[PDB]
């Protein structure tokens, strides 16, 4: 009695390949037969914690600066907040080198050109809905939800201040800043860039940077 023969030596212990491989061959046979700009928001109203004048410190240097001194210093204004920033990013083989292409954060929204308006991906809110009047996606009833419910918003406030009732009802990310501990600012802004990057890469990666 012999159990291993010329036929059984070639066979698998229990798996059948025919169904899987013929499907693969059918796919191959079918082939042989031949069968971008993104956007983000900020508040223009001058009582806001982030302003058109200190914005580039908060977002570029990841450094909080009271606007008090910025106007007291006589600081001059940009037409809008668009950065061509350097940040060295690691290749899938691990070597880091920086590359950037237009991002626009909102500072003077109604001057915006027809090409750009509907680009919002993430959004810095002040609170009152009048901040968005005339913005596209604003619902004709005056409701801004088509922006905030589909887009990851941001709102910059002091840690101590009781959250704004519109913002708390709205789909907006709160950022808590200290009055006196300047060192705690950097991780907050890092969290901002983290969340913004998550959003851009998951939902607006096809937009160009």
């Amino acid at each position: 009695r012999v159990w291993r023969t010329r036929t059984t030596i070639l066979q698998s212990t229990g798996k059948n390949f025919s169904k899987n491989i013929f499907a693969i061959l059918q796919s191959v046979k079918a082939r042989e037969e031949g069968r971008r700009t993104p956007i983000i928001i900020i508040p223009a109203a001058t009582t806001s914690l982030i302003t058109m004048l200190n914005a580039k410190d908060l977002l570029q240097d990841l450094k909080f600066v009271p606007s008090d001194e910025k106007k007291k210093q006589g600081c001059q204004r940009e037409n809008e907040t668009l950065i061509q920033r350097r940040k060295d990013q690691m290749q899938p083989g691990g070597t880091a080198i920086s590359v950037t292409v237009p991002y626009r954060v909102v500072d003077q929204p109604l001057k915006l050109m027809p090409q750009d308006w509907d680009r919002v991906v993430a959004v810095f809110v002040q609170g009152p809905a009048w901040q968005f009047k005339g913005w596209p996606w604003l619902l004709p009833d005056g409701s801004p939800v088509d922006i905030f419910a589909k887009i990851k918003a941001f709102h910059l406030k002091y840690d101590e201040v009781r959250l704004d009732p519109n913002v708390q009802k709205w789909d907006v990310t709160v950022l808590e800043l200290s009055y006196h501990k300047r060192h705690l600012d950097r991780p907050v802004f890092l969290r901002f860039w983290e969340t913004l990057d998550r959003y851009m890469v998951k939902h607006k990666s096809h937009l160009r940077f």
Binding site: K181, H183, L184, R186, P187
Partner: protein, 41 residues
């Protein structure tokens, strides 16, 4: 380096809150901190 700045900032912050507050009745606290465990003996 980015984290090292933050750590030095946190160490002073957490240290300054640990400072004894003027007005603290440390005598009453000491008396209670010694009298309370004496009840468990």
């Amino acid at each position: 380096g980015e984290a090292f700045d933050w750590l030095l900032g946190e160490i002073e912050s957490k240290f300054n809150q640990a400072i004894a507050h003027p007005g603290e009745m440390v005598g009453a606290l000491a008396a209670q901190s010694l009298g309370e465990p004496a009840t468990q003996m």
